[PDB]
Swiss-Prot record:
Belongs to the krueppel C2H2-type zinc-finger protein family. This is Zinc finger protein 473. The C2H2-type zinc finger 2 to 6 are necessary and sufficient for discrete Cajal bodies localization. The C2H2-type zinc finger 5 to 10 are necessary and sufficient for interaction with LSM11. The C2H2-type zinc finger 2 to 8 are necessary for interaction with the SLBP/RNA complex in the histone pre-mRNAs. The C2H2-type zinc finger 2 to 10 confer activity in histone pre-mRNA processing. The chain holds residues 725 to 757 of 871 of the full protein. A zinc finger (C2H2-type) spans 13-35. The lineage of its organism: Eukaryota, Metazoa, Chordata, Craniata, Vertebrata. It is found in: Nucleus. The gene is ZNF473. It comes from Homo sapiens. Involved in histone 3'-end pre-mRNA processing by associating with U7 snRNP and interacting with SLBP/pre-mRNA complex. Increases histone 3'-end pre-mRNA processing but has no effect on U7 snRNP levels, when overexpressed. Required for cell cycle progression from G1 to S phases.
Amino acid sequence: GSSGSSGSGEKPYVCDYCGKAFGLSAELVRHQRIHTGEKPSGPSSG
Ligand SMILES: [Zn+2]
């Protein structure tokens, strides 16, 4: 039962769907992907 991920600070680019924080917009966009799943070309989803 491991735990503890202290390091990521409050970022200006935080998602609303789930509520994730991202320092760079790119990180936020690529993330939103998890929320938008369509035409999945290849076994990749978790
Ligand atoms: Zn999200």
